[PDB]
Amino acid sequence: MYLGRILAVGRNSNGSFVAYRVSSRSFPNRTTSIQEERVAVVPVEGHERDVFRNPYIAYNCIRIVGDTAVVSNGSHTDTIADKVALGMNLRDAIGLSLLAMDYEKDELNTPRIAAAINGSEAFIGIVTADGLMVSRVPEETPVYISTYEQTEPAATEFKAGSPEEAAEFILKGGEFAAFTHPVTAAAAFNDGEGWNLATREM
Template identity: 55%
Template sequence: MYLGRIVSIGSNENGVYASYRVSSRSFPNRKSIVNANKVAIVPTEGSEEDIYKNIYISYNCIDIIDDICVITNGSHTDIIAGKIREGMNMRDALALSLLAMDYEKDEYHTPRIAGVINTKGEGFIGIITDSGIEVKKVNPNESYYISVYEQTTPMEVEYPVKDAHQAAEYIYDQGVFKEFTNPVTSCAAFGKSNGWEIDFKNPQE
């Protein structure tokens, strides 16, 4: 099954996670890079001109603001994070930004997906498509994922990880995610009361 881009957020007895996977048939030459408290998806070396073919393939996918992690499949990461920095609550920042940005205006009407979660395990996961919007609350000790294709409503998932490295590996090709095709790169943040750590998986490197 091909899901395209995937967002998953949640928590377990070990801590809180937010993970992201790029799956792609059209633009597979991408990687995750870390810059301070952010992760960006960018073309690999030699594929930089792909951004002129599709404006949606390069963006920040993770941004951490104090005890909150924002994770999305596009440029709305920056919008949600900006609203939270201005003092807006997580739910409203996610919902307002999805409404304002709308689905991606490509030939597929690709949905925008997003998650926001704090180190207590409280969060929201959502999607906007060309037919509607859905935002779901995520409680402590719950985990959900959502994707741009097929699984376009929040789905419960077991996510047995202990750190950011395991979280990035898990969404790439473990558990239920191993059933989903065309993985390209993944990244994750893992949070505890003392803050967040970030890791990523770039198989092409």
């Protein structure tokens, strides 16, 4: 039931979205700082030195580039977002980034997961010690994936009509309530009039 970092992507009757959640046992001292077209996962007041021992705990988890929302559990959020801003299709932007960045070199070979959505398409991917998988997000249902256990996209009836609702849901809502060690979350939602960011602190 410990999935580590989790992300969800898809469309509802209310709009499209991207949701991210940090689950952790070793670094509970982190929060999500919202900014202009970007949400970063950063250390809490006083724990800013934690990044020099573990370089995987600080990074942008959500980037908004034009009509596209990008989400991931690491610095590859920028790598992917930059390629989209430069013109690369989603499938390749995620594929190229994950292939090059690869899994994280920690005690668990923590996979790098990501997803991206624009007005008409969405892809989700993961890179592990055993492979690279980037796949189209089904038009029928939203999906989620995590660094541990659920290392394959899985369907989800994501309920939300705003970024704050989306963040809350991946944090405590529905099936995610069961996944342990919640730390913090973030999300981007597009009601059809643009992307809006929001966060939630357990």
